[PDB]
């Protein structure tokens, strides 16, 4: 009953935090992607597909962070409203309460093991093909109103632009062929009421048609080839990476003791930085192995030091 009480609380508040971090971590990136789309450097209709393909990438970080934060909010609530004094006072320690959530942490470890090993590469594989398809945009696709856009041998100036990136107005095109048009609808561009000049050939017209990574490789291809340090860092990042859930379990148990007057959220910001120091260390370990300076053995060592430090602090 006490295990089901905690699992229901942790799952409920971890999913709230995970959905709260997804809205913030990728809401900021979606807005940044919208900023690129507002300048024509990215199709406005695909920026929702980019967020879809980066779901496993961000949820790779949010899931340990959501589990860690959700664990301390639950354990903070037990301390704040005196449910821990009656649990300790009945013979159930805080370490014992954290050991009742090992079956839950194993489920979250398996879930993130799926993200890190399968969907994070799969999401990054489709995103890389999609993003490279948006890097070929040039010419009238990158045009901006009241500005000159130069892409290779093309210089395009549009006096106005619709809400969608079509129906240009007051168009100036330069190579040397100079083309000026009153209207242009979209590379294939249909120019309306325009003039074409060669720099001396002049040709007025009424209409005219102008015709100017190892991070995403499948885990199957990375199971072998451990000799290459680049694959060694990435494959180790996918195998020892999911075990940050366990470290997020025994470190949230250690750093959750809070006074009733201090609050449920008192130990969040101090202890999110202690958790983030683990991830920053693990990102700083992934790069060195990529340059063949540290070796793949340092992934469990980074987790073990934080695992032992959290276990020792919870037993002081």
């Amino acid at each position: 009953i006490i295990r089901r009480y905690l699992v229901k609380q942790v799952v409920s508040t971890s999913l709230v935090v995970i959905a709260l971090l997804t809205l913030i971590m990728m809401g900021g990136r979606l807005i940044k992607y919208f900023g690129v789309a507002a300048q024509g450097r990215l199709d406005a209709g695909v920026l929702f597909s980019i967020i879809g393909y980066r779901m496993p990438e961000f949820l790779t970080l949010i899931l340990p962070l959501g589990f860690f934060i959700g664990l301390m909010l639950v354990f903070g609530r037990l301390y704040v409203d005196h449910e821990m004094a009656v649990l300790n006072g009945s013979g159930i320690s805080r370490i014992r309460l954290g050991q009742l959530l090992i079956p839950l942490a194993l489920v979250f470890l398996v879930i993130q093991g799926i993200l890190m090993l399968w969907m994070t590469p799969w999401g990054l594989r489709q995103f890389d093909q999609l993003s490279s398809s948006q890097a070929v945009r040039t010419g009238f696709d990158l045009v901006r109103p009241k500005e000159f856009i130069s892409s290779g041998p093309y210089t395009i100036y549009a006096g106005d632009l619709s809400e969608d990136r079509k129906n240009l107005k007051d168009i100036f095109f330069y190579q040397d062929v100079m083309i000026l048009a009153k209207e242009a609808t979209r590379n294939v561009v249909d120019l309306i009421q325009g003039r074409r000049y060669e720099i001396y050939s002049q040709a007025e017209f009424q209409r005219y048609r102008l015709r100017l990574k190892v991070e995403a490789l499948p885990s199957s291809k990375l199971w072998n080839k451990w000799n290459d340090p680049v694959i060694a860092s990435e494959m180790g990042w996918r195998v020892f990476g999911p075990f940050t859930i366990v470290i997020a379990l025994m470190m949230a148990v250690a750093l959750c003791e809070v006074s009733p007057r201090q609050g449920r959220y008192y130990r969040l910001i101090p202890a999110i930085f202690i958790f983030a120091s683990l991830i920053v260390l693990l990102i700083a370990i992934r790069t060195r192995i990529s340059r063949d300076e540290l070796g793949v053995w340092a992934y469990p060592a980074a987790l073990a030091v934080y695992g032992i430090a959290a276990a020792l602090f919870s037993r002081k």
Binding site: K146, F148, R264
Partner: protein, 338 residues
């Protein structure tokens, strides 16, 4: 009343300045981590620390709106949780008076925001860029009915491979003049050599003609409209408006700067109204967490509505002054509910 006013102002001012010191230090450390992955042979760790350290005034300028929000939350939260705001009302000090005292603390940050924007950020930005990477090239400009392309432009008044194309009200060519070098002597005229000028065929060893390009604004062409200081931005916009059309990315930058002091005060008033309203009797950690959600919510909302002003017809004033007016109205309503 002065003793009460000093206590409320000083407590909030130390919380607004204390949060400012912490938030800048964290952003310098966090930015340095991201800048530590770009090291190379000519860009060492020390060279990457100066580039981040020189950017501190620009990180400082963008933290002031969110440090004033958290400062008023923590500054008044300490007063509220200690039951000090209750006994100011118990003697006859209104809610709008206590808000006015907090605004005095924020007015120090607004003045600091002006000093950074006008005299500090545009200088350290130049120093920061020189640390990493160590005049506009291919400049395309329109001056009314004339299109001017200069391959090389210098702030001291030097040009290379000028090309000016003239047009009519009916958009018909007159002259496509080309030069090799150009010099600036007076406004509205530039001296140049090898004036191979078409006429609808002519040549000239040396002759000046009228063009509105000025070397003073040459160094502002490459600078993003957001990064330009208000003194630089308004002067540049006035220069473009006199000869061409100002792009909507400069109008948005102008409105995002003139409404910067009013977004700092409005976000403080929202913080004060939350202390007297929803965030009353809450923990200090919960107030700090909520103050972080309002800060991100405001930063994302002002970022998104800035972008939305560049894609939609209405003027950027509506999108920039939108949240500021609504948060002031909503924040002042939470104060009316007491």
């Amino acid at each position: 009343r002065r003793i009460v006013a000093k206590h409320v102002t000083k407590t909030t001012a130390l919380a607004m300045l204390g949060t400012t010191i912490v938030l800048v230090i964290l952003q310098v450390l966090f930015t340095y981590l991201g800048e530590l992955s770009n090291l190379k042979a000519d860009y060492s760790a020390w060279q990457a620390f100066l580039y981040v350290l020189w950017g501190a005034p620009r990180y400082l300028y963008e933290i002031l709106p969110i440090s004033a929000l958290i400062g008023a939350i923590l500054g008044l939260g300490t007063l509220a949780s200690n039951s000090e705001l209750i006994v100011m009302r118990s003697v006859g000090i209104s809610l709008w008076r206590i808000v006015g005292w907090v605004i005095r603390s924020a007015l120090v940050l607004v003045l600091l925001s002006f000093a950074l924007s006008e005299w500090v950020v545009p200088y350290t930005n130049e120093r920061a860029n020189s640390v990493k990477s160590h005049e506009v090239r291919g400049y395309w400009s329109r001056e009314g009915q004339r299109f001017i392309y200069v391959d090389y432009a210098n702030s001291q008044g030097q040009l290379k491979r000028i090309q000016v194309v003239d047009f009519d009200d009916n958009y018909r060519l007159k002259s496509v003049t080309n030069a090799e070098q150009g010099q600036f002597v007076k406004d509205g005229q530039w001296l140049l050599n090898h004036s191979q000028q078409m006429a609808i065929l002519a040549n000239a060893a040396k002759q000046p003609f009228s063009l509105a390009l000025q070397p003073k604004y040459v160094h502002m062409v490459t600078i993003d409209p957001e990064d330009l200081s208000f003194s630089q931005l308004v002067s540049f916009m006035n220069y473009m408006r006199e000869y061409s059309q100002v792009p909507k990315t400069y109008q948005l930058a102008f409105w995002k700067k003139v409404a910067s002091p009013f977004a700092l005060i409005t976000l403080v008033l929202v913080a004060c109204s939350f202390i007297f309203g929803p965030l009353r009797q809450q923990s200090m950690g919960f107030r700090l967490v909520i103050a972080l959600f309002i800060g991100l919510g405001f930063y994302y909302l002002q970022d998104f509505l800035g972008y939305a002003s560049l894609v939609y017809n209405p003027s950027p004033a509506w999108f920039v002054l939108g949240p500021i007016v609504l948060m002031f109205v909503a924040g002042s309503y939470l104060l009316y509910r007491a």
